[PDB]
């Protein structure tokens, strides 16, 4: 994201969320990383969209971590 504290990732695999709170995406989408919320999940959002939620770290290539 534009906020320099956010991170940046590119989806590495498709991800379908298990429920609403999990954010689905496809490989190749750029994702803003808001927070690494635990040892396995990020909170993030997709630029240009209203898509936002959590997803597992496994499913992205992290380019820049959030601060
Ligand atoms: Cl869930
Ligand atoms: Na899933």
UniProtKB/Swiss-Prot annotation:
It is found in: Cell junction, Adherens junction; Cell membrane; Cytoplasm, Cytoskeleton; Cell junction, Focal adhesion. Residues 7-65 form the SH3 domain. Detected in skeletal muscle (at protein level). Widely expressed with highest levels in heart and skeletal muscle. O-glycosylated. Plays a role in tyrosine phosphorylation of CBL by linking CBL to the insulin receptor. Required for insulin-stimulated glucose transport. Involved in formation of actin stress fibers and focal adhesions. Interacts (via third SH3 domain) with the Ten-1 ICD form of TENM1; the interaction induces the translocation of SORBS1 to the nucleus. Interacts with INSM1. Interacts with the long isoform of AFDN and with VCL. AFDN and VCL bind to SORBS1 in a competitive manner and do not form a ternary complex. Interacts with ABL1, CBL, CBLB and INPPL1/SHIP2 through the third SH3 domain. Interaction with ABL1 occurs only after insulin stimulation while this has no effect on the interaction with INPPL1. Interacts with the insulin receptor but dissociates from it following insulin stimulation. This is Sorbin and SH3 domain-containing protein 1. It comes from Homo sapiens. The chain holds residues 870 to 930 of 1292 of the full protein.
């Amino acid at each position: 994201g534009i906020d320099p504290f956010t991170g940046e990732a590119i989806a590495k695999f498709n991800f379908n969320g298990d429920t609403q709170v999990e954010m689905s995406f496809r490989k190749g989408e750029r994702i803003t990383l808001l927070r690494q919320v635990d040892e396995n999940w990020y909170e993030g959002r997709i630029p240009g969209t209203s898509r936002q939620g959590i997803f597992p770290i496994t499913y992205v290539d992290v380019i820049k971590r959030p601060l």
